[PDB]
Amino acid sequence: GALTESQAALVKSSWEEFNANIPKHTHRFFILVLEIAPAAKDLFSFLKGTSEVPQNNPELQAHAGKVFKLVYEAAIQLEVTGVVVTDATLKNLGSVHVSKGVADAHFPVVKEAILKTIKEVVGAKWSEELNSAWTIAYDELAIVIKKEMDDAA
Numbered sequence: 061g062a063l064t065e066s067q068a069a070l071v072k073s074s075w076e077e078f079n080a081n082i083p084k085h086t087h088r089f090f091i092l093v094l095e096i097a098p099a100a101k102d103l104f105s106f107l108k109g110t111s112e113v114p115q116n117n118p119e120l121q122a123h124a125g126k127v128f129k130l131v132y133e134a135a136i137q138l139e140v141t142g143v144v145v146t147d148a149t150l151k152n153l154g155s156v157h158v159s160k161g162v163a164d165a166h167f168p169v170v171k172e173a174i175l176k177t178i179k180e181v182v183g184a185k186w187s188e189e190l191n192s193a194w195t196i197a198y199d200e201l202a203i204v205i206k207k208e209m210d211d212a213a
């Protein structure tokens with residue numbers, strides 16, 4: 061696809077839409093995760109011991125917000141510059157995932173959970189050209205974190 065000026069404009073616009081409702085989009089995102097894969101629950105400190113996904117847990121919200129921010133920032137950086145840049149933060153991210161027991165086959169779980177989350181977020185504006193734009197940005201960012209986990213292990 062690339063990342064035409066016209067595609068990037070379409071990711072920005074759809075991220076602004078996501079941030080606009082963190083407690084919803086973030087608890088949604090954790091349920092689409094547990095639907096695709098239920099066992100994933102024991103991994104998360106704030107989900108252990110619970111029977112259901114807490115809806116107002118600040119620990120969970122702050123956690124899932126930081127996740128989507130990082131995908132969007134990736135798309136713009138691809139249209140301007142042509143790439144996704146690896147920094148300290150992406151590296152520390154790779155360590156914590158490993159401590160907690162996370163693996164690569166967990167990633168399509170979270171991608172489908174994010175495309176389905178953004179198709180749910182943009183509704184009728186959805187275009188091929190947009191799906192094509194977030195797919196390219198997640199795929200490009202996951203490539204980068206998987207790379208750093210492997211390195212934290």
Ligand code: HEM
Nearest residue numbers: 100103104105106123126127130160162166167170201202
């Ligand atoms: C591009 C994709 C991904 C991004 C951008 C991302 C980002 C993050 C961030 C930023 C943190 C730490 C947040 C904090 O300090 O508050 C974190 C923690 C964690 N991540 Fe991910 N993540 C990704 C994929 C995954 C996958 C595929 C899994 C597996 C299900 C996973 C499981 C976890 C767990 C268990 C923790 C620790 C939570 C704790 O017990 O408190 N992540 N992630």
